[PDB]
Enzyme design. Sequence first.
Site, PDB file in Angstrom:
ATOM      1  CG  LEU A  16       4.044 -42.297 -22.212  1.00 25.46           C
ATOM      2  CD1 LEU A  16       4.493 -41.021 -21.516  1.00 25.46           C
ATOM      3  CD2 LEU A  16       5.225 -43.252 -22.349  1.00 25.46           C
ATOM      4  N   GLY A  17       0.106 -44.609 -20.948  1.00 25.33           N
ATOM      5  CA  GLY A  17      -0.856 -45.314 -20.105  1.00 25.33           C
ATOM      6  C   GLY A  17      -2.137 -44.530 -19.908  1.00 25.33           C
ATOM      7  CB  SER A  23      -5.049 -41.653 -22.495  1.00 22.79           C
ATOM      8  OG  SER A  23      -5.143 -40.743 -23.574  1.00 22.79           O
ATOM      9  CE  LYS A  43      -4.407 -36.818 -16.929  1.00 19.37           C
ATOM     10  NZ  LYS A  43      -4.332 -36.934 -15.453  1.00 19.37           N
ATOM     11  CG  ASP A 137      -4.755 -41.069  -7.434  1.00 25.62           C
ATOM     12  OD1 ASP A 137      -4.962 -42.195  -6.924  1.00 25.62           O
ATOM     13  OD2 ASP A 137      -4.624 -40.909  -8.666  1.00 25.62           O
TER      14      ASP A 137
HETATM   15  O1  LIG Z   1       6.548 -39.103 -18.783  1.00 25.79           O
HETATM   16  C1  LIG Z   1       5.532 -38.640 -18.227  1.00 25.79           C
HETATM   17  C2  LIG Z   1       4.540 -39.510 -17.770  1.00 25.79           C
HETATM   18  C3  LIG Z   1       3.402 -38.980 -17.163  1.00 25.79           C
HETATM   19  N1  LIG Z   1       2.356 -39.759 -16.618  1.00 25.79           N
HETATM   20  C4  LIG Z   1       2.291 -41.093 -16.485  1.00 25.79           C
HETATM   21  O2  LIG Z   1       3.172 -41.838 -16.916  1.00 25.79           O
HETATM   22  C5  LIG Z   1       1.053 -41.631 -15.777  1.00 25.79           C
HETATM   23  C6  LIG Z   1       0.084 -42.382 -16.413  1.00 25.79           C
HETATM   24 CL1  LIG Z   1       0.332 -42.742 -18.110  1.00 25.79          CL
HETATM   25  C7  LIG Z   1      -1.052 -42.878 -15.777  1.00 25.79           C
HETATM   26  C8  LIG Z   1      -1.239 -42.594 -14.425  1.00 25.79           C
HETATM   27  C9  LIG Z   1      -0.281 -41.834 -13.757  1.00 25.79           C
HETATM   28  C10 LIG Z   1       0.848 -41.362 -14.433  1.00 25.79           C
HETATM   29 CL2  LIG Z   1       2.062 -40.400 -13.548  1.00 25.79          CL
HETATM   30  C11 LIG Z   1       3.318 -37.588 -17.017  1.00 25.79           C
HETATM   31  C12 LIG Z   1       4.340 -36.758 -17.496  1.00 25.79           C
HETATM   32  N2  LIG Z   1       5.419 -37.296 -18.072  1.00 25.79           N
END
Ligand SMILES: O=C1C=C(NC(=O)c2c(Cl)cccc2Cl)CC=N1
Length: 291
Positions: A16-17, A23, A43, A137
């Site tokens: 997801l990122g 991550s 996470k 943040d």
């Molecule tokens: O579907 C999700 C997605 C989440 N987080 C993010 O997408 C996210 C990333 Cl990958 C990097 C920085 C900040 C954020 Cl919010 C958390 C919970 N459920």
Amino acid sequence: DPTQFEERHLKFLQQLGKGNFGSVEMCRYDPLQDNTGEVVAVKKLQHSTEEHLRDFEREIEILKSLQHDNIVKYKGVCYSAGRRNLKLIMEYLPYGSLRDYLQKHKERIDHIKLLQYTSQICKGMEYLGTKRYIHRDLATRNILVENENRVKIGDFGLTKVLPQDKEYYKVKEPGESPIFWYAPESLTESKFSVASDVWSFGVVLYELFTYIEKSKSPPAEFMRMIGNDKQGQMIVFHLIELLKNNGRLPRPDGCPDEIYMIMTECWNNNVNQRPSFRDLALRVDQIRDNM
Ligand SMILES: O=C1C=C(NC(=O)c2c(Cl)cccc2Cl)CC=N1
């Protein structure tokens, strides 16, 4: 106990990122091994050091303590054997981050919707404040879209708890810092409070009404104002000086006046004169009501 997720049943689906120390991955918790399980967000730490695991544990405890419509839901944790590595399990919000969502759909999201999101972000931040948590943040990349009508604050990786006796938290050895969202006192003295979070909220509002235009981002705009030739620590020095002299992000094109007024009130050098999140939600809901 379904807050207990066995790591071997968590099937990787998509990256997801990345955010601060960790991550996030889209996974299916699939203990029937038949692909019917719940899709969750997971996470985990990129570098599971001593210091980071303690901060991560604290982050997990923070999120678990928060139950609000505009805050991402905690689901559980994974523990690994021996070295006590930790994965945080959260609801998956399929529409992704508010930043990407807005960058994608742009002006097709009208002011009505932007102010619903604004209200919702304010409400989640107000609740956070009643727990004496400081986000540090607040930015569109850390806010998630559940659907067209609902956003949630989605990452708490820099969140600090106020000491019992103080109304600010002072970070003694800063790591990576989103300085273009930072209040002047956060830049100068590393002091973080409800009031500095309100400063950052005004930047989120700017983000929203610029529709994440790259040339208009807080970094691109602040760099222009201090000069693109500034580098490293000199960026912080010039930014401090810029803010002290009332240099501010410009009014976004098409931004309603009363929305722009809110931004500039959040960006007050005087910490005590910044509005409260309670008042901001009330004001924002008033403006939506008028519309
Ligand atoms: O579907 C999700 C997605 C989440 N987080 C993010 O997408 C996210 C990333 Cl990958 C990097 C920085 C900040 C954020 Cl919010 C958390 C919970 N459920």
